[PDB]
């Protein structure tokens, strides 16, 4: 019937976590004044900020 592809809930690709998320980033990188890590490795931080998927077959 009504070709509705996705559920209308933000859980698509929104990061609705707390600010502890930033602390989690400090876990994958150096855990100190790490500001130079995102100030320089924008590519590494972007790849570290991608979403996951789980396909559904009809």
């Amino acid at each position: 019937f009504r070709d509705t592809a996705s559920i209308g809930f933000s859980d698509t690709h929104q990061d609705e976590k707390t600010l502890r998320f930033l602390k989690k980033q400090i876990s994958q990188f150096i855990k100190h004044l790490k500001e130079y890590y995102p100030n320089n490795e924008l590519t590494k931080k972007l790849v570290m900020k991608y979403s996951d998927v789980q396909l559904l077959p009809y």
Partner: protein, 53 residues
């Protein structure tokens, strides 16, 4: 000295720095003494209302 100083930013004041760790190792006292337990037939008795002879 002017830019590499660590500031008390967000993430360091999270509640999980206290709630995730239990207060059991900071308040409990070491025992190393076994606990007792006894049968119910030892404190109550033997119930003398059994047979007669």
């Amino acid at each position: 000295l002017l830019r590499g100083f660590e500031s008390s930013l967000r993430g360091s004041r999270v509640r999980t720095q206290i709630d995730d760790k239990s207060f059991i190792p900071y308040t409990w006292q070491m025992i190393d003494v076994p606990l007792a337990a006894a049968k119910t037939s030892f404190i109550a008795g033997l119930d003398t209302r059994q047979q007669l002879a």
